[PDB]
Amino acid sequence: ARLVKILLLGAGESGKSTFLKQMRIIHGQDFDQRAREEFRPTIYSNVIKGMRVLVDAREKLHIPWGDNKNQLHGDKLMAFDTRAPMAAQGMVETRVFLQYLPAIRALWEDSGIQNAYDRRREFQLGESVKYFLDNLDKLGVPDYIPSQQDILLARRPTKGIHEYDFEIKNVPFKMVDVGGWFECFDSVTSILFLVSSSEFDQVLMEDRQTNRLTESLNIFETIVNNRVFSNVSIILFLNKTDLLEEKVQVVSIKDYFLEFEGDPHCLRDVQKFLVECFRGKRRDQQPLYHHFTTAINTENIRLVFRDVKDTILHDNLK
Ligand SMILES: Nc1nc2c(ncn2[C@@H]2O[C@H](COP(=O)(O)OP(=O)(O)O)[C@@H](O)[C@H]2O)c(=O)[nH]1
Numbered sequence: 001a002r003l004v005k006i007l008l009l010g011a012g013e014s015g016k017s018t019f020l021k022q023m024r025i026i027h028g029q030d031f032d033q034r035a036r037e038e039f040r041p042t043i044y045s046n047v048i049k050g051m052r053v054l055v056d057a058r059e060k061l062h063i064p065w066g067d068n069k070n071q072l073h074g075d076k077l078m079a080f081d082t083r084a085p086m087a088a089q090g091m092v093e094t095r096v097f098l099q100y101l102p103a104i105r106a107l108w109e110d111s112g113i114q115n116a117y118d119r120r121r122e123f124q125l126g127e128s129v130k131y132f133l134d135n136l137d138k139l140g141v142p143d144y145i146p147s148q149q150d151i152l153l154a155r156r157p158t159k160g161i162h163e164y165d166f167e168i169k170n171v172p173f174k175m176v177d178v179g180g181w182f183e184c185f186d187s188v189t190s191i192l193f194l195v196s197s198s199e200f201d202q203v204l205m206e207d208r209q210t211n212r213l214t215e216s217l218n219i220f221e222t223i224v225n226n227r228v229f230s231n232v233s234i235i236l237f238l239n240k241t242d243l244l245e246e247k248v249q250v251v252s253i254k255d256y257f258l259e260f261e262g263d264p265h266c267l268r269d270v271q272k273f274l275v276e277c278f279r280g281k282r283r284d285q286q287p288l289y290h291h292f293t294t295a296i297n298t299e300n301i302r303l304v305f306r307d308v309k310d311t312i313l314h315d316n317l318k
Contacts (some may be wrong), residue, residue: 002171002172003172003173003174003189004171004172004173004174004189004190004312004313004316005173005174005175005176005187005188005189005190006173006174006175006176006188006189006190006191006192006312007175007176007177007178007184007185007188007190007191007192008020008175008176008177008178008191008192008194009178009180009181009191009192009193009194009219009223010180010193010194010195010216010219010237010239011180011195011196011212011215011216011219012157012158012179012180013127013157013180013196014180014194014195014196014216014239014240015194015196015237015239015240015293015295015296016158016177016179016180016194017156017158017162017177018152018295018296019177019192019194019237019295019301020162020164020175020177021151021152022152022295022298022301022302022305023164023166023173023175023305024164024166025148025152025298026298026301026302026305027166027167027168027173027305028164028166030148031148031151033145036145036146036147036151037145037146039146039150039151039154040094040144040145040146041086041090041091041092041093042090042091042154042155042156043132043139043146043150043154044091044092044093044094044096044097044139045087045090045091045092046126046128046129046132046154046155047097047104047129047132047133047136047139048077048080048087048092048097048100048104049126050125050126050128050129050132050133051077051104051107051108051113051129051133052077052078052080052082053123053124053125053126053129054107054113054116054117054125054129055074055077055078055107055113055116056078056123057116057119057120057122057123057125058074058112058113058115058116059074060123061116061119061122061123063112063115063116063119064112065110065112066109066110066111066112066113066114066115067110067111070106070107070110070112070113072103073102073103073104073106073107074107076100076103077100077103077104077107080100090156090157094142094144097139098140098142101136101139101140104133104136105136105140108133108136117130121251124205126155127153127155127240127243128153128154128155131153132150132153135150148298149296152295152296152298153296157179158177158179158180159179160179161176161177161178161179161184162176162177163175163176163177168309171309171313180219185228185229188229188232189232189233189312189316190232190233190234190235190308190311190312190315190316191223191229191232191233191234191235192235192237192308193220193223193234193235193236193237194237194239194295195213195216195220195236195237195238195239195274195278196212196216196239196240196243197238197239197240197241197243197244197271197274197292198240198241198243198244198246198247199212199213199216199240200212200213200247200253200256200257200270200274201247201251201253201255201256211256213256213257213274213277217277217278217281220236220278220281221281224278224281224282225281225282225283233289233311233312233315233316234288234289235289235290235291235308235311236275236278236288236289236290236291237290237291237292237293237295237304238271238274238275238290238291238292238293239293239294239295240294240295241292241293241294242294242296242297244267244270244271245267248264248265248266248267248270249265252264252265253270253273257273257277259273260273261273271292275288275290278290289308289311291304291307291308
């Protein structure tokens with residue numbers, strides 16, 4: 001009754017897992033040393049895969065090496081057994097990571113690899129890679145304990161369902177992340193719908209016909225127009241705002257969405273257009289609650305959730 005049930009919905013990589021971690025950070029029990037420890041294998045895997053993508057890129061993009069001696073380290077990492085039990089699970093043990101760390105460190109120092117990194121628009125590199133590559137100092141310490149920020153940036157896909165249960169001032173929340181469905185649809189108070197707002201110029205890896213924003217808009221359409229959710233507060237999170245702010249400076253959304261009007265290099269104009277894209281998916285209304293978020297930024301999410309909490313209670317009361 002007093003229980004607020006919130007679903008997190010949105011395509012994969014939209015920031016749902018990261019939002020759940022922020023709830024634990026902000027309103028729950030912060031990860032203790034053993035909890036943080038469990039992330040270490042994922043972080044190491046994120047780094048190994050990222051550098052593997054970068055060595056593969058500069059090769060396939062024909063960028064010349066910075067120092068030609070790094071070929072050896074490129075080969076070293078291209079020979080990493082992805083197939084193996086642990087690695088196939090998106091996990092790399094400490095001892096294994098430390099075997100590669102010298103190659104990784106030398107490769108990130110390379111101007112050719114730095115060049116490859118700059119042309120990342122041209123291939124698929126995980127959001128966390130540069131953050132961890134610049135943090136090779138601390139990951140490489142024999143008893144590295146991941147920090148809060150490291151855990152937020154650690155990328156592991158969600159295959160099933162995650163839940164975190166927390167209270168704010170004796171108000172209990174049940175928050176459920178359904179990966180990117182109909183079984184958790186029961187007794188829902190609010191839906192937070194996460195969008196990677198910076199992916200307007202990307203297609204689905206498994207379906208190059210489909211624009212990633214288009215894929216998000218179509219998912220949203222099926223939710224927002226379902227009668228089952230008529231009394232449910234639906235709140236749009238245009239996430240990855242830090243990335244959208246960078247991308248608008250260099251890419252024009254008009255090239256992708258012919259309906260855009262305004263200045264495509266103006267973040268505010270682009271955000272206005274995205275909001276209108278989602279609003280326009282609804283068949284029978286005229287407020288779509290929305291926030292421009294950066295799910296990895298704890299201070300942002302603190303403010304946003306404060307606002308969302310008020311929205312839900314104002315609505316969920318009335
Ligand atoms: N730069 C940036 N990275 C983000 C943001 N939100 C999430 N990420 C990262 O993007 C990746 C995908 O996020 P994740 O929560 O796992 O998406 P999920 O598949 O919906 O659960 C992770 O590495 C997150 O750290 C954001 O707002 N900005």
